[PDB]
């Protein structure tokens with residue numbers, strides 16, 4: 314498959330900035346969701362899950378075709394709980410009916426991170442909705458009950474290397490697990506709706522204890538009320554992952570720069586951009602705009 318980026322006809326920077334503003338303002342307004350964590354965490358989880366179905370071998374999956382909108386992908390077990398992020402973005406799509414689904418889903422992730430005080434993520438437009446028969450089959454998204462060699466091998470299908478995987482994983486400072494969605498329960502830290510290098514600091518500073526949870530799954534629990542998944546705990550079991558974890562713990566700006574590069578690569582995998590295409594857009598925050 315080739316997937317050529319096609320700008321939505323007649324739209325420019327100013328148009329996409331209005332869709333960003335709309336998402337950012339509704340993030341401000343619906344602050345009560347999930348005990349006052351707000352929708353920002355589920356929105357970056359949604360942008361990583363629409364993107365994480367990609368396979369570099371045959372160019373199937375990825376963010377381009379906006380296929381999460383179809384039943385098969387929407388009802389994938391690994392996506393339980395994302396229906397909340399979909400329902401949030403849906404009034405915004407009715408307001409701007411011209412934006413493609415993959416562009417809206419991916420832009421929700423960019424808006425969430427920058428409004429939660431994160432790095433600026435450059436974003437590119439151009440995904441085109443594709444038919445229901447291009448919807449990836451269930452089962453391409455990663456398991457939590459596994460080790461550092463599973464993680465390295467999995468992320469290789471999206472050709473992410475070690476540094477990219479560790480940086481990407483740092484988005485687990487946001488939000489929390491929910492027993493009814495994934496069989497795991499608890500947050501990764503205290504400030505779970507502000508983007509910081511906290512996940513790395515908890516991983517190197519907490520006295521973690523392995524316990525079974527109410528779903529019979531194992532997880533690492535700390536005295537502080539925080540949890541780590543087996544796949545998360547892997548990053549300090551592997552000698553190569555652990556030097557990067559330490560590096561991000563001592564330097565949030567290096568983590569912000571590397572997370573910025575890898576989240577954009579994750580959102581653009583599987584998409585060919587012609588060089589007549591617009592440069593990546595850097596969107597302003599509500600705060601930068603005085604709104």
Ligand code: HEM
Nearest residue numbers: 354358361394455456457481484487488489490491494495
């Ligand atoms: C091996 C990789 C990964 C695994 C096994 C994994 C697994 C999970 C699980 C089990 C949950 C909890 C879902 C729930 O109960 O609602 C979760 C949540 C979340 N994940 Fe990951 N994760 C992985 C990678 C990533 C990456 C690369 C990102 C983002 C760039 C990410 C972002 C999030 C966010 C922000 C949440 C919280 C959402 C919320 O609060 O509802 N994850 N992850």
